[PDB]
Amino acid sequence: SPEQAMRERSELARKGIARAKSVVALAYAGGVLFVAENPSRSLQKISELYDRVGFAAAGKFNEFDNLRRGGIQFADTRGYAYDRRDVTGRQLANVYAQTLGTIFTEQAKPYEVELCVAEVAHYGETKRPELYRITYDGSIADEPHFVVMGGTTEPIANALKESYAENASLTDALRIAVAALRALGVASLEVAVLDANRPRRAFRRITGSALQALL
Amino acid sequence: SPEQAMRERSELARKGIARAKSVVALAYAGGVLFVAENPSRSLQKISELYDRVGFAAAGKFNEFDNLRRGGIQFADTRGYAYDRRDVTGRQLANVYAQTLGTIFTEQAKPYEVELCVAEVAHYGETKRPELYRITYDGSIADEPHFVVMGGTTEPIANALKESYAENASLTDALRIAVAALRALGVASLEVAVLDANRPRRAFRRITGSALQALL
Amino acid sequence: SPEQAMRERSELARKGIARAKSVVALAYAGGVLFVAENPSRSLQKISELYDRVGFAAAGKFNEFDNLRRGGIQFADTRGYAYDRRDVTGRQLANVYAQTLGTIFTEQAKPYEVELCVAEVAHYGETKRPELYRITYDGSIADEPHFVVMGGTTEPIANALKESYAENASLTDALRIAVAALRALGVASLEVAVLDANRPRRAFRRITGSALQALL
Amino acid sequence: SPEQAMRERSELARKGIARAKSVVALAYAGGVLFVAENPSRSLQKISELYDRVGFAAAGKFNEFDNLRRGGIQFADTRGYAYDRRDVTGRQLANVYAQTLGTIFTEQAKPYEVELCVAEVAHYGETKRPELYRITYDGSIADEPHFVVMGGTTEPIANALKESYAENASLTDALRIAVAALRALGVASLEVAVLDANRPRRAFRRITGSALQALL
Amino acid sequence: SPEQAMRERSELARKGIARAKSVVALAYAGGVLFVAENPSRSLQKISELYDRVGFAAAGKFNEFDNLRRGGIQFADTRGYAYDRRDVTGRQLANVYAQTLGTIFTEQAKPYEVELCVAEVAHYGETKRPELYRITYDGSIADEPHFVVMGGTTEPIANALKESYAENASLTDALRIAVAALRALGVASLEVAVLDANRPRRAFRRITGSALQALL
Amino acid sequence: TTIVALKYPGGVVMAGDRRSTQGNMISGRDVRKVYITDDYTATGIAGTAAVAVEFARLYAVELEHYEKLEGVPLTFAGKINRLAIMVRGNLAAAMQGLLALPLLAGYDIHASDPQSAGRIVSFDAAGGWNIEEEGYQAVGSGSLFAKSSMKKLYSQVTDGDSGLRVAVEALYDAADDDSATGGPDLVRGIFPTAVIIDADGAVDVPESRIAELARAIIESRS
Amino acid sequence: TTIVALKYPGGVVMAGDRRSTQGNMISGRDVRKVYITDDYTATGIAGTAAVAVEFARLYAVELEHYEKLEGVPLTFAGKINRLAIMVRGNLAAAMQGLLALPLLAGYDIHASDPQSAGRIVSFDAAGGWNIEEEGYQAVGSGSLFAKSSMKKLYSQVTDGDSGLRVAVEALYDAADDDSATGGPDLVRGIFPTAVIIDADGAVDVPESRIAELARAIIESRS
Amino acid sequence: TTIVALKYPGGVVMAGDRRSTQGNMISGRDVRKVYITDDYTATGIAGTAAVAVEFARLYAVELEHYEKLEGVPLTFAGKINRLAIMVRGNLAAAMQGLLALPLLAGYDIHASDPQSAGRIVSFDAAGGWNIEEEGYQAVGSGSLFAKSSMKKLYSQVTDGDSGLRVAVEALYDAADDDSATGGPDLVRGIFPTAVIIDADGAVDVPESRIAELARAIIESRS
Amino acid sequence: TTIVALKYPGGVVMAGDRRSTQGNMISGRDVRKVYITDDYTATGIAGTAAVAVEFARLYAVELEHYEKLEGVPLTFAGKINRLAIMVRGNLAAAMQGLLALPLLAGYDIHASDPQSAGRIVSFDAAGGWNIEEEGYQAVGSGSLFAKSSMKKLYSQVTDGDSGLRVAVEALYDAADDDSATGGPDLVRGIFPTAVIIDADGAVDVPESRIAELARAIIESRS
């Protein structure tokens, strides 16, 4: 039955998501913070999409790497066609939702990926950071506080919900994120920030000695 | 047998539409009023199609967003080809019915959406507003008073039929719509109007302080 | 096996046609009269194909609307290619039959429609009106007196057979058609005529006060 | 099994021609005589293909009508390419055989038709008329005396075999054909002749007063 | 069921990989060392991809030979388009992961191959050699010390884990690799090195009397 | 070739000559250059006769096709836009000698004041359109003389008959000053064609009225 | 080349010469330039002989093809439109050197008055068509002389034979004034071809009648 | 053609003339060359009238299409880029005579200081754009005279009324020194069109105010 | 136009004028021709202004696109190759008048010696590139005068300020001997733009420093 096929496909995608590392994206005073469990130093699950737009994912590496490349290609073309300030995270989230829905419906195997797109305000502007979560079937949700991806997200989400504090500093937010994600050392962590204080490009990786000092 | 496949596709679409928020489009003295249960502030289920033509939908977001973009593309092309006053809501409703029927019959998964196209009179012209409802299979119907989409529509339809008043004011119409939809708060509501008194563009969103005061 | 699948497909089309409003087309002294039960005011089942050629249909609206558009496109192109008087109702009926047969055989879901193409004589010329009926599978039949479409056609067919009179006036023909269709009011009725007395375009709608007074 | 499918397809076609009207094509002194039982006055089962080549068919109307149009297109193109006298009934019979075989093997539903291609001699030339019967699967047979198509052809074939006489006049040939087909009035009869005495175009229809008087 | 197809496709690929010769790629002081069991002298499982990038594989010969040619074509085009020093082993590993995932998902039979890409530092530059292992389904992993491919890999992996020594010379590394691979002779072995001391092209084969003396 | 169009209180009138020449040689003495496209529109095309007939036929088919498909005729702006698009599409062929200049007259049923519902639209070589507000327009080789005659005679227009007479006189002046424009033929009895559009629709003026008007003008100038 | 056509009460007649030349050299003395396309239509084509034959054959094939497919012949307007379409499509090749000008004569069986059912249609270089109402037309290099002769001689046309005589005399004048049109060759016995169309169809005039008419004309002018 | 645009404290104003000519002949006397594209932008196109109308319509359609699709209007840089792309795509047609020069006036609602939120953008034939910082710009055949008049008159601009008066005077000077630009017609009552953009949006200036200003300038120069 | 670049111990400096003309007429007084393509490379393009802006924007977009996709910026050779490909792709349009020559300045972070990490790259019309080893380069219509001035002034370059002064002096000389280059306008206060690249990145020189240097040069030459 077509309904049986759809349920089996959804079960396969959900099982793929569950057997994966966890990623947390949380808003803090300076912008958005991405913390991921990544033992690899070369393969990155956190990346920049555009000047004020960042990307995080959980699942099979090649699939969300392809989605990352497609999103970057879309964002650069859209920024060139009209202007850099015309690109927003909502457009990228919508494109990802449509693409993932098409993949889930039409492709032979569904994408076992769970995506988050984060946007911060421009320089010298005030605006609450926006977080959008996209699932395997193409569903889109707006998360106002934090996004948790991959693995068993119930304990992680509960810990984040209890420990969340608005307008927290970078060090405090990082400590909260690692403590919630534990339920790790300087290595086997990928940390990045969308910093609203930067002039043009907000994305910045925090690795090595600086991460060890903050952690 | 193919008939089993057809009934299973219809059941899948009906289940998808039922597990969704409800939308109400009702005609009042100043035009047409759209009220939707939308917790999110960025995703919109109510939109403008053309100068006097508005659009509402219920179901999977990305599907009716794709249909929204297609209808906008059709309306702009038709208006450029002949004239702005040659675009009517009947043509958009017919195009939506045709494309929805084609998708239901041929696509891998049927679209779990229900659409409503509303039209108001031009400036300095009197005409009863038109409401068209299009379902997943492509069936198109004309509703003279109100259209209810998504969720359990029987109680909402019964409440509207009991409380509907022709030529009601905007405040009375909004109160009736909210009362029928409840069977909500200032937030988690999307309110829009096709206002027949506007010179060219009738679509207008009612949000924030205005929605708080009027409701 | 192909036989079982074809029988199920034919049964699906027949059940689709059965749960639909009835249409009657009958020849009278002035030409051809179309009477349909149409509660809607905007969605119309009776239309003009060409100067002296009219079209009636019963079934799913989007399907026979698509067929109507295709037939109009064929007729206009044929008239422009050779001449207006070289377009006949026989050619349009044959094109419709071939198209419907191909759709039934090759398409995923058969068209649940039944068509009638009617033709009258030119101005200042005497000729018996011609009525052609096309079914879902493409079978084409010539009905010399009347055509009944959709729903349970047996009672209306017998009522017309008992009540039909050749060379009847417009009022008498409308009374007979309404009486047979009942076995309705001014509203929820669509009435049109191919009038052989018109100079070029024979199609004319009878709606509103004229329909009320004549009936 | 592939053989099960082929046998089922052949049975479907055989039943398709079985429930159809019969056509008899027989050679007489003046050429070839086609006699069919056809109540309709607009739908024609007997037609001309080329100057001395005529065509008859029995089965589903739209299918053999498509075959008729294709054969006319082939004949006119071949005649223009080389000469009018280079087109023969054998070539049309062969192309029909190839087309019908391809349709039977490849198409979703086989054509439920049987064809007869007849040819007579040119003006001032003596040659026995040729008749070719083409079946639903593409089999082609050269019939020297008469061809019977559609319905239960056993009694008609036996009656013709007992009653046929070479060099019979047109009136005697029509009497024999009608007697064999009855086992009919002026109406519900289609009579045509490939008359070898005509200078260029041999095909001629015999309808109305001439048919009523001659029969 | 998608799950059923994927598990009978994964076990097919695993069985194909298992019945194959084992390859070891391990880092040593001078760069990277590839040691494989290859009795043939013309068919080679170890090859160069680019100036500082080498390739090793285990499985069906024609499949990873096709992958080798594709990787070489990608690397040369990338080097020509931008520069030779813009080509890294990480990009080649990513391309291999994409291609292998697509083949596993879409092709009729998945490739029964297991790839390893090795990169060393440039001339006069210090950097730890990088090893990437790509499996049949497109999964990509980073190995810091050694990679074992094909056959029963548990004994060789344990032997290397026990006996691996960082900064070991070429002789010590070759002896350890051969000892672990045994758990054979100068013939039926293929030995190659990515040598970081070479000016431009690092890949160098060690065969014949040189391999006899070194081993 | 000359086609004139002018508004009168409550409607519009549009007239055209009958001569078609190939060089200096007269090839046609009874060509019809004014066509009734729809119930309330009439178009007249100057230039090559073949292209004129082709555009008239194609434009009428286009409008009828849209009306049959959508069940509602186009607004006047839509008709203007379609004609302008068709003119723009022929620019390449016009550069090759297949030139056609259309002039469109209509009656807007959706206008507010019915007495001022007449509309005259002129198209230039680039496909642009302009709704003339001076009340008259002309196209063809003799368009300048016709327009300059209408400029002086337009004060006399008060109704349909006066507008028709002024149009006929303008065509007569254009034929008087231009050799490619055919004047009223009193020998063969061939006179300019005319179409009058008002609230009741568009109707062809019978040749009798045009003949009497032309004879009166001819006797006036004698 | 010269092909004339003229109407007489109750039908039409179309006549054509026989000479075909390349440059100043005579290459053909017995070319047939008038074809009977259908039962009630005849077409002559002037210009390059190859293009004339090709268009005649293709037009006859097209008309018979439509008649066979739809079981009913085209109306006269349909045939005119198809011929005009081929004329328009040949414009690119006509500018290249393969020019062909057709002239169509027919008898409308659907006409109201049988005495006036004959129709003559002429096509110009741009593909536009015009139905002659003066009763005669001509095409070819010598068309002007033939038309100017028929203008004087058309008052004598009262039936089929008088019309045939007038057509032959017009061809004689065209051949007398133009060197590319062949006259009656008495030495070789080659005379113009003619086709007469009436209610009974289109029929070729036998060579003896045209020979007698040409001899009478020649003795008259001596 | 001549279109002037200038900034005043708190907004921008754009004015344009009404004449349209083909060569030396005056063909249009009431053309409108300034269009209100969005709530806060207005564009004027000089050159071929047909291309001007086409670009105005298409640019407005594109901006409104983007706003409808994305739910938010383009930033001023986005609008500038779309207009520049449109200009660049017309280079082939401009080399063939269908040239169109746009001048864009707008109000940057996202600008920090409302008193300096007016923006003027000029385009060249190669599609490049420049945001004028001198406070005034002009396009058209008489653009040089208009710019040289505004250079002397711009010290008097202090509000919307003064800016409108200076724009009208610049148009008057351009029409005075150039024959292709139409001046204020006191006979026909046709005056240049104007659009004023401020924080409240873009509004068409009523004809009465422009008529008063033009009459005052005319009596001042008498 | 003129854009100069020169290396100094520890970095590179690159300056450009502000004038843009259309023939002999000055149309722009504050054009910015020197861009910061990325944190360590600046690009200045001489020729058509539209093409220069388009190439600068596209080159910056391509560099950032590669950096975002691959997770590591291009090497200096890769950037040079991409710019050369971009130049070569414009040759067909350059023959049509859309000519543009770029000059690239950079600071190679991967170079062994920081004191000599500045790089100057010049491109020709055929896409060929050359890394200048004499320490200075110039492009534009006035490039010859700038290069001949820097050939004499380059012995004074010892740090960033000396290099900036030499670049401004070279631009002053180029503007002095060439009318297409704009000199320092003391009336409007418009001065050449400059970019300084060193180990800390690429930064724009504030206008006050360049104004001071230009005033000093002008007083020295008075």
PDB file of C-alpha atoms in Angstrom, chain C residues 92-187:
ATOM      1  CA  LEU C  92     -15.310  18.394 -33.121  1.00  0.00           C
ATOM      2  CA  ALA C  93     -17.209  15.288 -32.017  1.00  0.00           C
ATOM      3  CA  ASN C  94     -14.655  13.054 -33.747  1.00  0.00           C
ATOM      4  CA  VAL C  95     -11.744  14.901 -32.124  1.00  0.00           C
ATOM      5  CA  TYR C  96     -13.414  14.608 -28.718  1.00  0.00           C
ATOM      6  CA  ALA C  97     -14.022  10.886 -29.238  1.00  0.00           C
ATOM      7  CA  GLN C  98     -10.399  10.224 -30.193  1.00  0.00           C
ATOM      8  CA  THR C  99      -9.069  12.320 -27.300  1.00  0.00           C
ATOM      9  CA  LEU C 100     -11.341  10.628 -24.759  1.00  0.00           C
ATOM     10  CA  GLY C 101     -10.426   7.171 -26.036  1.00  0.00           C
ATOM     11  CA  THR C 102      -6.720   7.942 -25.756  1.00  0.00           C
ATOM     12  CA  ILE C 103      -7.239   9.369 -22.257  1.00  0.00           C
ATOM     13  CA  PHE C 104      -9.186   6.288 -21.167  1.00  0.00           C
ATOM     14  CA  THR C 105      -6.565   3.885 -22.511  1.00  0.00           C
ATOM     15  CA  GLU C 106      -3.329   5.621 -21.501  1.00  0.00           C
ATOM     16  CA  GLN C 107      -3.979   8.012 -18.589  1.00  0.00           C
ATOM     17  CA  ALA C 108      -3.591   6.905 -14.953  1.00  0.00           C
ATOM     18  CA  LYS C 109      -7.201   7.789 -14.109  1.00  0.00           C
ATOM     19  CA  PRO C 110      -9.953   7.840 -16.753  1.00  0.00           C
ATOM     20  CA  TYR C 111     -12.012  10.968 -17.326  1.00  0.00           C
ATOM     21  CA  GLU C 112     -15.399  10.636 -15.605  1.00  0.00           C
ATOM     22  CA  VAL C 113     -17.129  12.845 -18.168  1.00  0.00           C
ATOM     23  CA  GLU C 114     -19.806  12.571 -20.838  1.00  0.00           C
ATOM     24  CA  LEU C 115     -19.966  15.106 -23.669  1.00  0.00           C
ATOM     25  CA  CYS C 116     -22.479  16.314 -26.241  1.00  0.00           C
ATOM     26  CA  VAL C 117     -21.618  18.406 -29.293  1.00  0.00           C
ATOM     27  CA  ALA C 118     -24.560  20.151 -30.953  1.00  0.00           C
ATOM     28  CA  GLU C 119     -24.689  21.860 -34.338  1.00  0.00           C
ATOM     29  CA  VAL C 120     -27.377  23.929 -36.057  1.00  0.00           C
ATOM     30  CA  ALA C 121     -27.769  25.197 -39.607  1.00  0.00           C
ATOM     31  CA  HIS C 122     -26.299  28.459 -40.863  1.00  0.00           C
ATOM     32  CA  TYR C 123     -28.300  31.645 -41.351  1.00  0.00           C
ATOM     33  CA  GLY C 124     -30.946  31.420 -44.051  1.00  0.00           C
ATOM     34  CA  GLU C 125     -30.376  27.674 -44.381  1.00  0.00           C
ATOM     35  CA  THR C 126     -32.540  24.695 -43.446  1.00  0.00           C
ATOM     36  CA  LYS C 127     -30.991  21.614 -41.841  1.00  0.00           C
ATOM     37  CA  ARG C 128     -31.935  19.340 -38.980  1.00  0.00           C
ATOM     38  CA  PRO C 129     -29.918  20.028 -35.804  1.00  0.00           C
ATOM     39  CA  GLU C 130     -27.249  17.419 -35.088  1.00  0.00           C
ATOM     40  CA  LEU C 131     -26.464  16.037 -31.624  1.00  0.00           C
ATOM     41  CA  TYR C 132     -23.462  13.816 -30.883  1.00  0.00           C
ATOM     42  CA  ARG C 133     -22.866  12.030 -27.577  1.00  0.00           C
ATOM     43  CA  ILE C 134     -19.370  10.941 -26.520  1.00  0.00           C
ATOM     44  CA  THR C 135     -18.834   8.656 -23.530  1.00  0.00           C
ATOM     45  CA  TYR C 136     -15.830   8.111 -21.274  1.00  0.00           C
ATOM     46  CA  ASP C 137     -14.233   5.443 -23.481  1.00  0.00           C
ATOM     47  CA  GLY C 138     -14.560   7.455 -26.711  1.00  0.00           C
ATOM     48  CA  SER C 139     -17.689   5.837 -28.161  1.00  0.00           C
ATOM     49  CA  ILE C 140     -19.556   8.310 -30.369  1.00  0.00           C
ATOM     50  CA  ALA C 141     -23.291   8.151 -31.074  1.00  0.00           C
ATOM     51  CA  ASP C 142     -25.663  10.322 -33.109  1.00  0.00           C
ATOM     52  CA  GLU C 143     -28.822  11.238 -31.203  1.00  0.00           C
ATOM     53  CA  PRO C 144     -31.443  12.734 -33.537  1.00  0.00           C
ATOM     54  CA  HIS C 145     -33.884  13.960 -30.894  1.00  0.00           C
ATOM     55  CA  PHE C 146     -32.408  14.396 -27.412  1.00  0.00           C
ATOM     56  CA  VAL C 147     -29.375  13.588 -25.267  1.00  0.00           C
ATOM     57  CA  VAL C 148     -29.432  12.904 -21.513  1.00  0.00           C
ATOM     58  CA  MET C 149     -26.188  12.970 -19.535  1.00  0.00           C
ATOM     59  CA  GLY C 150     -25.113  12.022 -16.038  1.00  0.00           C
ATOM     60  CA  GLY C 151     -26.943  10.620 -13.048  1.00  0.00           C
ATOM     61  CA  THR C 152     -29.673   8.030 -13.468  1.00  0.00           C
ATOM     62  CA  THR C 153     -30.515   8.753 -17.099  1.00  0.00           C
ATOM     63  CA  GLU C 154     -33.246   6.120 -17.512  1.00  0.00           C
ATOM     64  CA  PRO C 155     -36.149   8.050 -15.886  1.00  0.00           C
ATOM     65  CA  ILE C 156     -35.301  11.291 -17.700  1.00  0.00           C
ATOM     66  CA  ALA C 157     -34.886   9.395 -20.972  1.00  0.00           C
ATOM     67  CA  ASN C 158     -38.309   7.753 -20.647  1.00  0.00           C
ATOM     68  CA  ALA C 159     -39.941  11.028 -19.581  1.00  0.00           C
ATOM     69  CA  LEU C 160     -38.467  12.811 -22.605  1.00  0.00           C
ATOM     70  CA  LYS C 161     -39.450   9.944 -24.912  1.00  0.00           C
ATOM     71  CA  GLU C 162     -43.061  10.223 -23.760  1.00  0.00           C
ATOM     72  CA  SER C 163     -43.128  14.028 -23.715  1.00  0.00           C
ATOM     73  CA  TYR C 164     -40.892  15.022 -26.649  1.00  0.00           C
ATOM     74  CA  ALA C 165     -42.588  16.613 -29.660  1.00  0.00           C
ATOM     75  CA  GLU C 166     -40.734  17.577 -32.827  1.00  0.00           C
ATOM     76  CA  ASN C 167     -40.690  21.229 -33.935  1.00  0.00           C
ATOM     77  CA  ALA C 168     -41.844  22.438 -30.515  1.00  0.00           C
ATOM     78  CA  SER C 169     -41.501  26.075 -29.499  1.00  0.00           C
ATOM     79  CA  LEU C 170     -38.873  27.291 -27.036  1.00  0.00           C
ATOM     80  CA  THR C 171     -41.291  27.567 -24.103  1.00  0.00           C
ATOM     81  CA  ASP C 172     -42.808  24.141 -24.789  1.00  0.00           C
ATOM     82  CA  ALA C 173     -39.359  22.565 -25.120  1.00  0.00           C
ATOM     83  CA  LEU C 174     -38.177  24.175 -21.878  1.00  0.00           C
ATOM     84  CA  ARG C 175     -41.303  22.957 -20.070  1.00  0.00           C
ATOM     85  CA  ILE C 176     -40.754  19.414 -21.360  1.00  0.00           C
ATOM     86  CA  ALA C 177     -37.059  19.459 -20.439  1.00  0.00           C
ATOM     87  CA  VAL C 178     -37.703  20.787 -16.924  1.00  0.00           C
ATOM     88  CA  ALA C 179     -40.521  18.288 -16.342  1.00  0.00           C
ATOM     89  CA  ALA C 180     -38.293  15.410 -17.454  1.00  0.00           C
ATOM     90  CA  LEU C 181     -35.351  16.666 -15.385  1.00  0.00           C
ATOM     91  CA  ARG C 182     -37.496  16.911 -12.242  1.00  0.00           C
ATOM     92  CA  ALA C 183     -38.502  13.250 -12.606  1.00  0.00           C
ATOM     93  CA  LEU C 184     -36.465  22.696 -10.968  1.00  0.00           C
ATOM     94  CA  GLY C 185     -36.569  26.320  -9.882  1.00  0.00           C
ATOM     95  CA  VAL C 186     -35.302  29.316 -11.810  1.00  0.00           C
ATOM     96  CA  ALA C 187     -32.158  29.199  -9.701  1.00  0.00           C
TER      97      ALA C 187
END
